[PDB]
């Protein structure tokens, strides 16, 4: 093309403003660009990945640099529980003198406090001085440059990888599993043993003395001799003060279980052992596929041979090998799905099994991290289903996958969708019904008539791991259980202490109130899934539009006929599911925050009793904890929470603005724009200036996207302010 | 601009050509149907994408299908 | 078919004896994925040439006349960097950079790998065969230097003794 | 230009951040010059296209 | 190394900018050189004033009330009068430059080569014969040649001053005074 | 001094850079190669 | 009349997702991206209309129109082939004392005008040309 969308003649030859809008949003769909060959596609994608990696490293470099140049890491290291971590400095020419003072509280210059947890992580991993952080930043800047060079290099004529190289699954998997994940873990345990653990005990091991400071007194003698037990002897005493030698030990690899008494975090020795074990597992697993050395498995054969003899699963997995290798969308979907689960797990396990020192005592940071990863997880999950649908519309070959496990899924689509619908209905009616019952009776002044179910099943699981409050004498909660006898001399001692300590988030106590919220979360997952799954299955066709596959993943509609076909494309399913995703994640995050807020405040009872009905959430959570935020700036002054206050209102604006695009549709606006064109052409003086791109209204799908973005941005921003200002304003 | 295609399931009801707001469709002689006529889309350069034609087709599934595509001044219905 | 260097293995195709120093050595088969061995040859030469200078320099600095002035006296090769200072090091780096960027096209081009024009009067008035002999000599010396560099450096940090100190 | 520049100094000078400062008028002038530069960039770009 | 090739490659990689004279071009060499020559005067003047204590009430910070937060370096700390004055002097000059860039005359050397300017041809010709490694004597006096030679000299001096200052661990002003013989201070 | 950098770079990054970038995009999308 | 004037436009159909130039071309040969208004005594849109003392409203001065006489010609030219097919069929059906296609056309169109001629079946034509 000769216009902006060089990759699309259709858009390029467009006489309106759409040319600009669409060109920007269709830029990264390399597969649909004019004149795209598969080889070029892969090559360009590979190079683009190098660029993304570089951006990630530049981002990390910046954090280190700004903390080192404008932060208080060293002071924090000295007094971790009495210093507020600094992120970066503030230079806003719009600030008033008062603001300069407010944001400069506790320091000598205006500054922003970090709620990212970097200080704790770096403290745990070994960083003790600002100069060290600087070196890291410089190194990452260099690595970023190297990655950029690689992107250019592999796009050059003699270094462009072949399409075959891009499809050698065995070699990549072997290498990625054994080297990227396995050896990297081994390297990490090396760092922990050589640098981190020594630092925790007061010894400095850096690039200056690492080659002459043995990690363990015995040496590598025990390792090669086979007497590995030596490395687990003399674990740090329970009276050990972190970052000092008082009460220190010599152990480097142990399975103590539990948390360091003073830092209330997992033992470093245990983490080292953890990564060492994981390393061996992955390195071994990376020797499973054939890679030009004779031995190994061929993935195609494995998939083809797996067909249940009964015939209940049809022809089995035959045909899937080719489908996956020849479809980038399916690959992306599988990846996003797994990463989404991982992100949720990080959030869930990181607040219970605190990994970093003094992180549990920083309430605001702990709250931010959870909400951060949970939201990212939602986006990652939705994307997986989205690309799954794109696959069906674009890359699915009905003939190749004949009676395959995948095809049969599309044969009982109605069954799946219908049953998922029933589940959603059941959960919805009863969950809401029970909440309303509890609200009404309480309102009428009769709280004794509430329907409160104890979460017995969950309580049982907690007891099974050792919790004793519930009084369920089972498994690890039983002294006579075979399980207790097994680990009583291994890891249970430490675990049974933490699990039965009320001041830890390991298996928090649950009650009737938790039962209901969990069932609400269930509703969210099921309903969000219904929308996404339906979109995927009904993406290649439906009774209303039996030829949907010929129109694509995203199209405005199919006309006002046959009853009306608005929002009938698969893209619209993503659009609709996004709202539900936000709602469910919101419920999850609200639950975590309120529960923890009450615990931190010392009144766990408030949640226990007020969480049973809806008014409680509104009055004892949203209304009560909004007081610090809404008073960031008042008719009498301002404080450091002013920025957070302003953002809260800003979020509401964006959210509501989104509604305009969602409820108002194109026809109205197009007609109005026409009148404006008339005016400009008929008004003297302004007539001198004219447009080169005809002014037109936004398209149907465009408006949907714009609206969803406005809704989403406002949603996240408003909650971000609340979770931070409320927690910090009250407990910090 | 847009693409309009007619399929063999047409019955020559002429309803589509009587609904087009921009004279894009015509009735041409044919022998595959009792009516002895089929619809054609000689002037797709004037299709605005209304899909009124599709709404008028009586066949189980539209015998006339409009696939929206590249947009021009004519297709975007711009009088300015 | 079978490698000359390793008699019990099959020689990779690209190794056909055309280039200097082709003793049919590529056990791991790193030559197949590459379109040609030009860029690799450039690197082999560059790495080797740098190593040649390094080994010589290390020995000289440990047992040789140093330049006049303090900060230029430390015999320890590793300590020298810090002692001499950033200014000195930076100037060398910038110079090397200029040469590297000036010959950029040569490195990524299709010319004789390793030739940047610094041939002195040598490699002139000589037949192709004689030229190849000279080139082979260079590659052999390059490889020897690289092996030596590893040994010298490792010996220094493991045994913590001078290179020419032979004590048992 | 002569016409538009004369009336623009007013808004900045009497309602700007440093209006009550002794250097308010000077600041107003600088602000106006800045706005003129922005408008000039626009004119240049329009012509090119 | 041939210089010409590198310039050609740049033009190819960034053709749009090259069209106007941006990048490694004679136009840039001339303009950047002129500015450097002029600056030397400014820097020397600053040194003289600093040494002879001419700047009024230096080492004092502007009022955060009279001026605004725009005058703050960190928190409520403000810029010293000296730096402020030096900047204003430069702003006087920059303003002249902006006028020349936006409103060129009919017989002036425009910053960028514009086909619609009457001086395009002369400029194109002058640049075409002004390239070389060694200053071309025999064209001394006020000639395009002399201008370029002096400009390159000035630009080199700037680089040298910064380097020497660093090596000797001193301010650039100090190095200037030293090279003059300590006259300014 | 590095301390002066915040007051010398922020004006450029938030005002000069965005302006020129937007101008270039406009010229790029309004040109007919 | 250049029947291809419209077809001869700068539009280039894309591969997939475009109907094409159709029957009368997809876009005007001329580019709409012209300039704005100009000072008194000057012109902007090439063959634009002088605004006289009101250059601000020059775009409202029409210069493009349809001549009724010329209109007749365009009707005839664009419908020439149809007329040809019609007369050809009339000739095929053994016309009474037929002469020449063109002659027949003139006779048949002398009566029944031209528009009526285009809208008449061969049978009606033969009945009409019985004489
Ligand atoms: C590794 C992750 C990954 C990768 C490589 C891709 C890659 C791709 N996706 Mg995909 N996607 C992902 C994750 C990913 N996605 C996730 C997580 C989701 C769920 C949200 C989706 C949902 C999704 C949909 C629904 C669609 C794609 C599409 C595409 C394709 C084209 C993308 C495009 O046109 O963008 C071009 C560039 C842009 C759109 C610019 C993005 C601008 C964003 C929307 C606004 C930025 C936010 C805002 C400005 C912040 C300001 C706030 C401030 C005021 C504070 C491309 C193959 C499209 C397609 O058709 O593929 C077939 C498509 O329809 N993806
Ligand atoms: C408060 C807002 C709200 C509410 C209540 C609902 C409710 C519902 N949505 Mg929904 N939705 C909303 C906003 C809302 N939506 C928004 C903003 C969007 C835009 C993204 C969507 C997009 C959306 C999609 C895309 C889908 C839904 C679906 C559903 C249904 C899920 C099944 C369920 O919960 O059954 C229970 C339903 C309820 C409890 C709600 C009605 C309750 C009434 C009052 C009856 C109560 C009866 C009571 C228990 C006593 C009965 C006995 C009595 C007669 C004596 C449900 C009707 C899914 C669906 O169709 O269901 C299968 C679906 O696919 N919604
Ligand atoms: C890999 C190459 C290499 C490197 C990086 C260094 C690095 C260093 N040397 Mg060293 N050196 C080298 C090779 C090298 N040497 C060789 C081959 C010799 C023997 C001639 C010496 C003899 C030597 C002495 C006698 C001394 C040093 C010293 C030093 C230190 C201060 C720099 C200096 O004065 O160098 C001095 C450099 C030379 C005397 C000659 C260097 C020979 C170069 C490599 C010839 C190659 C030039 C190249 C082909 C063309 C230019 C390349 C391009 C930039 C244009 C510094 C750590 C000083 C020291 O002890 O610091 C504490 C010192 O006193 N070196
Ligand atoms: C060119 C390469 C080279 C050379 C010449 C040397 C030379 C030397 N190394 Mg050394 N080294 C090298 C590479 C090299 N190394 C590498 C790559 C490493 C690993 C990173 C080491 C690690 C190393 C350690 C750890 C030690 C040495 C030691 C020594 C010294 C005694 C070696 C010895 O007892 O061997 C004795 C040899 C044998 C017992 C076997 C007999 C040799 C075989 C059978 C045949 C040899 C013939 C063969 C062609 C060698 C000719 C090449 C040579 C003459 C140029 C000696 C100066 C030791 C020492 O004390 O030095 C200070 C010592 O402690 N080196
Ligand atoms: C839209 C309403 C509005 C109004 C009237 C003002 C007014 C003002 N703001 Mg404010 N502001 C607003 C919204 C508004 N703000 C919003 C939404 C924000 C958030 C982004 C801000 C953020 C903000 C900041 C951060 C600052 C101000 C400042 C100022 C003052 C400087 C005025 C100035 O330089 O304008 C310049 C105006 C012009 C160059 C043109 C004015 C328009 C002309 C007069 C129209 C003429 C039309 C004409 C009559 C047509 C007929 C002509 C015909 C007869 C020939 C002034 C009191 C500054 C201050 O000191 O605060 C007091 C300051 O630092 N504002
Ligand atoms: C990081 C970006 C940035 C920066 C550094 C500033 C800086 C400033 N803004 Mg501001 N602003 C920004 C983004 C930014 N803004 C955005 C995004 C908005 C939209 C919401 C606004 C809206 C806004 C308003 C509404 C007002 C300001 C004002 C001011 C000034 C108040 C301080 C002062 O002394 O005023 C006193 C003013 C001076 C001492 C004059 C300083 C000299 C001027 C700035 C020279 C400008 C020339 C410049 C190079 C031209 C640009 C060329 C183009 C190619 C980029 C200050 C210069 C106020 C003001 O007075 O504006 C000037 C004001 O009324 N801003
Ligand atoms: C005040 C005063 O006057 O007293 C003086 C007296 C005195 C005694 C002289 C002093 C001194 C010492 C001084 C000035 C010392 C200066 C030292 C200096 C300048 C030292 C090294 C440059 C290093 C190089 C070039 C190294 C490698 C260059 C190498 C290794 C290359 O390989 C280049 C390379 O090209 C190859 C060959 C092949 C190419 O394919 C690849 C590349 C491009 C990479 C004092 C005491 O300081 C002060
Ligand atoms: C699905 C899956 O994952 O399957 C995988 C599993 C796995 C394990 C990865 C596989 C593997 C690899 C192998 C061969 C695994 C087998 C066994 C493994 C794990 C490793 C090997 C040998 C260890 C030896 C010989 C012991 C040395 C130990 C010695 C010599 C000693 O005992 C020293 C010592 O005696 C002294 C001198 C005195 C004593 O006082 C102290 C002790 C007793 C300590 C498989 C089987 O291939 C496939
Ligand atoms: C690597 C490579 C090559 C190279 C190279 C090399 C050597 C590149 C080096 C280029 C180099 C080093 C170019 C210096 C510029 C200095 C400038 C522009 C100074 C401006 C100075 C100005 C504009 C002055 C401004 C001020 O007056 C104002 C503005 C205000 C006053 O208050 C103060 C001062 C006076 C400061 C080859 C070998 C040639 C080709 C190969 O292919 C690629
Ligand atoms: C659309 C689509 C797609 C996508 C899909 C998806 C997205 C999916 C997801 C999925 C998922 C998301 C899944 C999940 C799962 C989970 C699981 C499977 C779990 C399990 C569990 C278990 C197995 C157990 C465990 C345990 C243990 C271990 C012990 C005891 C306890 C317990 C519990 C813990 C694709 C692209 C492919 C394409 C096609 C279509
Ligand atoms: C308001 C509104 C509009 C009109 C909104 C418009 C026209 C947005 C115009 C402003 C935005 C910010 C674009 C302005 C861009 C600037 C002119 C700068 C452009 C520079 C280019 C180089 C990009 C619609 O077109 C529409 C369509 C369908 C459903 C609902 C709606 C709707 O609600
Ligand atoms: S999108 Fe428009 S045309 Fe399609 S069904 Fe909805 S209203 Fe009708
Ligand atoms: S979509 Fe509209 S314009 Fe196109 S053929 Fe059908 S009725 Fe006619
Ligand atoms: S409405 Fe349908 S069936 Fe009737 S003529 Fe048109 S295309 Fe044929």
Output A488-494 pairs: Cβ under 8 A, ≥24 positions apart: A490/A255, A490/A257, A491/A255, A491/A256, A491/A257, A492/A257, A492/A466, A493/A257, A493/A258, A494/A256, A494/A257, A494/A258, A494/A259
CB B4 within 8 A of CB B25: yes
Burial group, residue C121, by CB count within 10 angstroms (0-12, 13-18, 19+): exposed
Q: Helices marked H in A444-566 — which ranges?
A: 456-464, 482-487, 492-499, 512-537
Half-sphere exposure of A368 (CA within 13 A, CB side): 20
- The resolution, in Å, is 2.8
CB A95 within 8 A of CB F6: no
Burial group, residue E161, by CB count within 10 angstroms (0-12, 13-18, 19+): middle
Distances (CA, A) of B74 to A14, B67, E119, G17: 11, 16, 46, 16
Q: Helices marked H in C7-85 — which ranges?
A: 38-62, 77-84
C-alpha A657/C-alpha A653 separation (Å) is 6
- A471 in contact with C, Cβ within 8 Å: no
Burial group, residue A469, by CB count within 10 angstroms (0-12, 13-18, 19+): middle
**Residue B35 neighbours by CB distance under 10 Å:** 13
**Residue F4 neighbours by CB distance under 10 Å:** 12
C-alpha A99/C-alpha A109 separation (Å) is 11
Q: What share of chain C is helix, strand, coil (3-state, %, to 5)?
A: 50, 0, 50
Which method resolved this structure? cryo-EM
Q: Which of A180, A174, A393 is nearest to A286 (CA)?
A: A174
C-alpha A625/C-alpha A595 separation (Å) is 13
What region does A219 belong to: left with phi over 0, alpha with psi -120 to 50, or beta? Answer: left
Under 8 Å CB-to-CB from A168, ≥6 apart: which residues?
Answer: none
Chain E residues near residue D40 by CB distance under 8 angstroms = 102
Q: Angle, nearest 10°, between helix axes E26-51 and E172-180? A: 80
When CB atoms are compared, the residue of A158, A165, A292 closest to C35 is A158
Q: Is the CB of A4 within 6 Å of ligand 1?
A: no
Q: What are phi and psi of A111, to 5 degrees?
A: -150, 160
C-alpha A284/C-alpha B56 separation (Å) is 66
CB B26 within 8 A of CB B66: no
User: For chain D, how many helices (H) and strands (E)?
Assistant: 2, 0
What region does A56 belong to: left with phi over 0, alpha with psi -120 to 50, or beta? Answer: alpha
When CB atoms are compared, the residue of A158, A159, A211 closest to C157 is A211
Q: Is the CB of B52 within 6 Å of ligand 13?
A: yes
For a pocket test of ligand 8, which of A227, A229, A283, A296 has the largest count of ligand atoms closer than 8 A to its C-beta? A227
Collapsed DSSP state (helix, strand, coil) of residue A16? strand
Bridge partners, E80 (sequence order):
E61
- F3 in contact with A, Cβ within 8 Å: no
Q: Which of A635, A631, A638 is nearest to A95 (CA)?
A: A638
Under 8 Å CB-to-CB from G65, ≥6 apart: which residues?
Answer: none
Scanning D5-34 for CB atoms below 8 A from E yields: 17-18, 21-23
Measured in angstroms, the CA of F28 and the nearest CA of chain A are apart by: 7
CB G42 within 8 A of CB B61: no
CA of A381 to the centre of ligand 12 (A): 30
Q: Is the CB of C7 within 6 Å of ligand 7?
A: no
Greatest CA separation for chain E = 60
Q: In b/e form, how buried is each residue of A175-196, taking b as 16+ CB within 10 angstroms?
A: bebbeebbeebeebbeebbbbb
Under 8 Å CB-to-CB from A424, ≥6 apart: which residues?
Answer: A523, A526, A527, A530
C-alpha A682/C-alpha A678 separation (Å) is 6
Measured in angstroms, the CA of C86 and the nearest CA of chain E are apart by: 9
- Kindly state the DSSP code that residue G7 receives in the 8-state scheme: T
C-alpha A594/C-alpha A365 separation (Å) is 15
C-alpha A669/C-alpha A696 separation (Å) is 9
**Residue A708 neighbours by CB distance under 10 Å:** 19
CA of C147 to the centre of ligand 3 (A): 20
- Kindly state the DSSP code that residue A266 receives in the 8-state scheme: B
- Contact: E66, D21; criterion CB under 8 Å: yes
C-alpha E33/C-alpha E27 separation (Å) is 10
Output D2-9 pairs: Cβ under 8 A, ≥24 positions apart: D5/D32, D5/D36, D8/D32, D8/D35, D8/D36
Half-sphere exposure of A161 (CA within 13 A, CB side): 17
């Amino acid at each position: 093309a000769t216009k902006f969308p060089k990759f699309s003649q259709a858009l390029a030859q467009d006489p309106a403003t759409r040319r600009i809008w669409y060109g920007i949003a269709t830029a990264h769909d390399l597969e649909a660009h004019d004149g795209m060959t598969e080889e070029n596609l892969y090559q360009k994608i590979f190079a683009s990945h190098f660029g993304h990696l570089a951006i990630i490293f530049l981002w990390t470099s910046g954090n280190l640099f700004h903390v080192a140049w404008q932060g208080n890491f060293e002071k924090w290291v000295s007094n971790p529980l009495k210093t507020r971590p600094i992120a970066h400095s503030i230079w806003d020419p719009h600030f008033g003198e008062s603001a300069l003072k407010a944001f400069s509280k506790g320091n000598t210059y205006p500054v922003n406090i970090t709620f990212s947890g970097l200080y704790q992580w770096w403290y745990t991993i070994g960083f003790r001085t600002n100069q060290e952080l600087y070196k890291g930043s410089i190194g990452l800047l260099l690595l970023a440059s190297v990655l950029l060079i690689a992107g250019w290099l592999h796009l050059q004529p003699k270094f462009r990888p072949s399409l075959s190289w891009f499809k050698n699954n065995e070699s990549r998997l072997n290498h990625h599993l054994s080297g990227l994940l396995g050896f990297s873990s081994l390297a990490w345990t090396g760092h922990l043993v050589h640098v981190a653990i020594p630092a925790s005990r007061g010894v400095h091991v850096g690039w200056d003395n690492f080659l002459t400071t043995p990690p363990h007194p015995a040496g590598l003698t025990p390792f090669f001799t086979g007497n590995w037990t030596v490395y687990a002897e003399n674990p740090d005493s329970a009276t050990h003060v972190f970052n000092t030698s008082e009460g220190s030990g010599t152990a480097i690899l142990t399975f103590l279980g539990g948390f360091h008494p003073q830092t209330q975090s997992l033992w470093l020795s245990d983490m080292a052992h953890h990564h060492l074990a994981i390393a061996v597992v992955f390195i071994v697993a990376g020797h499973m596929y054939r890679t030009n050395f004779g031995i190994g498995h061929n993935m195609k054969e494995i998939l083809d041979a797996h067909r249940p003899p009964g015939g209940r699963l049809g022809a089995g997995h035959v045909g899937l090998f080719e489908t996956i290798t020849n479809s980038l969308h399916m690959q992306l979907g599988l990846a996003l799905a797994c990463l989404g689960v991982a992100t949720s797990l990080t959030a869930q396990h990181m607040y219970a099994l605190t990994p970093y020192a003094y992180l549990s005592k920083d309430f605001t940071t702990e709250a931010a991290l959870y909400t951060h990863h949970q939201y990212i997880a939602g986006f990652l999950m939705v994307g997986a289903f989205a690309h799954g649908a794109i696959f069906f519309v674009r890359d699915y070959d009905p003939e190749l996958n004949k009676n395959n496990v995948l095809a049969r899924m599309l044969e009982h689509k109605e069954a799946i969708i219908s049953h998922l619908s029933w589940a959603s209905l059941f959960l919805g009616f009863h969950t809401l019904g029970l909440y309303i019952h509890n609200d009404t009776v309480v309102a009428f002044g009769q709280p004794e008539k509430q329907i409160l179910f104890e979460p017995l099943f969950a309580e049982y699981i907690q007891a099974a791991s050792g919790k004793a409050v519930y009084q369920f004498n089972v498994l690890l909660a039983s002294s006579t259980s075979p399980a207790t006898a097994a680990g009583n001399q291994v890891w249970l001692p430490g675990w049974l202490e933490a699990i039965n300590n009320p001041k830890t988030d390991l298996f928090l106590k649950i009650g009737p109130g938790d039962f209901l919220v969990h069932h609400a979360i269930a509703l969210g997952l099921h309903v969000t899934a219904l929308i996404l799954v339906k979109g995927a299955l009904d993406a290649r066709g439906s009774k209303l539009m039996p030829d949907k596959k010929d129109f694509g993943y995203s199209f405005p509609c199919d006309g006002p006929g046959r009853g009306g076909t608005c929002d009938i494309s698969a893209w619209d399913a993503f659009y609709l599911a996004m709202f539900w995703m936000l709602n469910t994640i919101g419920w999850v995050t609200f639950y975590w925050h309120w529960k923890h807020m009450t615990i931190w405040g010392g009144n766990p009872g408030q949640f226990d009793e007020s969480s049973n009905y809806i008014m409680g959430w509104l009055r004892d959570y949203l209304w009560l904890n909004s007081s610090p935020l809404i008073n960031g700036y008042n008719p009498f002054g301002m404080n450091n929470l002013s920025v957070w206050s302003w953002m809260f209102l800003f979020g509401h604006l964006i959210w509501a603005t989104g509604f305009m695009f969602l409820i108002s549709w194109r026809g109205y606006w197009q007609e109005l724009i026409e009148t404006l064109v008339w005016a400009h052409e008929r008004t003297p003086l302004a007539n001198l200036i004219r447009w080169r791109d005809k002014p037109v209204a936004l398209s149907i799908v465009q408006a949907r996207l714009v609206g969803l973005v406005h809704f989403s941005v406002g949603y996240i921003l408003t909650y971000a302010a609340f979770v931070i200002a409320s927690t910090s304003g009250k407990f910090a | 601009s847009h693409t309009v295609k007619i399929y063999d399931t047409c019955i020559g009801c002429t309803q589509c050509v009587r609904a087009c707001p921009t004279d894009v469709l015509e009735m041409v002689p044919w022998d595959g149907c009792k009516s002895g006529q089929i619809a054609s889309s000689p002037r797709v350069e004037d299709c605005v994408g209304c899909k009124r034609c599709e709404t008028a087709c009586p066949t189980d599934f539209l015998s006339v299908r409009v696939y929206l595509g590249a947009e021009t001044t004519r297709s975007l219905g711009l009088a300015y | 078919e079978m490698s000359k260097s390793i008699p019990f293995l099959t020689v990779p195709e690209k190794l056909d004896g055309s280039m200097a120093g082709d003793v049919g050595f590529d056990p791991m088969g790193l030559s197949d994925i590459q379109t040609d061995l030009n860029y690799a040859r450039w690197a082999e030469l560059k790495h080797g040439r740098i190593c040649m200078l390094a080994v010589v320099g290390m020995v000289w600095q440990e047992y040789g006349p140093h330049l006049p002035g303090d900060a230029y006296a430390t015999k320890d090769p590793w300590e020298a960097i810090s002692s001499v200072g950033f200014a000195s090091n930076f100037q060398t780096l910038l110079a090397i950079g200029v040469v590297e960027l000036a010959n950029w096209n040569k490195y990524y081009g299709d010319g004789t790998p390793g030739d940047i024009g610094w041939t002195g009067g040598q490699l002139s008035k000589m037949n192709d065969a004689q030229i190849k002999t000279r080139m082979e000599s260079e590659i052999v010396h390059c490889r020897l230097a690289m092996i030596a560099f590893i040994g010298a450096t490792h010996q220094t940090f493991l045994l913590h003794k001078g290179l020419l100190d032979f004590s048992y | 230009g002569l016409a538009h520049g004369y009336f623009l100094i007013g808004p900045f000078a009497q309602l700007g951040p440093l209006r009550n400062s002794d250097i308010g008028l000077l600041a107003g002038f600088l602000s106006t010059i800045g706005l003129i530069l922005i408008l000039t960039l626009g004119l240049t770009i329009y012509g090119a296209a | 190394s041939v210089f010409d090739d590198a310039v050609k490659d740049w033009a190819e990689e960034y053709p749009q900018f090259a069209a106007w004279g941006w990048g490694p071009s004679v136009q840039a060499e001339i303009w950047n050189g002129r500015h450097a020559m002029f600056g030397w005067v400014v820097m020397c003047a600053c040194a003289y004033a600093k040494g002879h204590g001419l700047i009024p009430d230096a080492d004092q910070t502007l009022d955060l009330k009279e001026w605004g937060t725009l005058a703050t370096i960190s928190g409520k700390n403000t810029i010293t009068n000296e730096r402020a004055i030096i900047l204003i002097a430069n702003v006087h000059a920059l303003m002249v430059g902006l006028a020349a860039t936006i409103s060129p005359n009919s017989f002036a050397d425009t910053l960028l080569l514009d086909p619609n300017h009457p001086m395009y041809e002369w400029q194109m010709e002058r640049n075409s014969k002004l390239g070389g490694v060694m200053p071309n004597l025999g064209k001394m006096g006020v000639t395009p040649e002399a201008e370029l030679a002096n400009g390159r000299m000035a630009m080199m001096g700037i680089i040298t001053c910064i380097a020497y200052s660093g090596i000797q661990g001193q301010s650039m002003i100090d190095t200037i005074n030293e090279w003059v013989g300590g006259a300014y201070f | 001094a590095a301390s002066f950098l915040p007051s010398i770079l922020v004006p450029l990054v938030g005002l000069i850079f965005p302006a020129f970038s937007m101008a270039l995009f406009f010229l790029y999308v309004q040109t007919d190669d | 009349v250049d029947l291809d004037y419209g077809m001869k436009n700068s539009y280039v159909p894309a591969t997939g997702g475009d109907g094409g130039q159709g029957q009368f071309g997809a876009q005007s040969p001329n580019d709409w991206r012209v300039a704005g208004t100009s000072p008194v005594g000057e012109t902007s849109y090439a063959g634009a209309a002088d605004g006289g003392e009101e250059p601000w409203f020059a775009e409202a001065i029409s210069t493009v129109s349809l001549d009724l006489q010329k209109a007749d010609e365009t009707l005839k030219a664009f419908t020439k082939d149809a007329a040809a097919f019609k007369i050809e069929e009339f000739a095929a059906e053994k016309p009474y004392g037929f002469t020449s296609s063109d002659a027949a056309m003139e006779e048949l169109v002398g009566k029944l005008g031209y528009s009526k001629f285009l809208e008449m079946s061969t049978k009606q034509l033969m009945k009409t040309w019985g004489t």
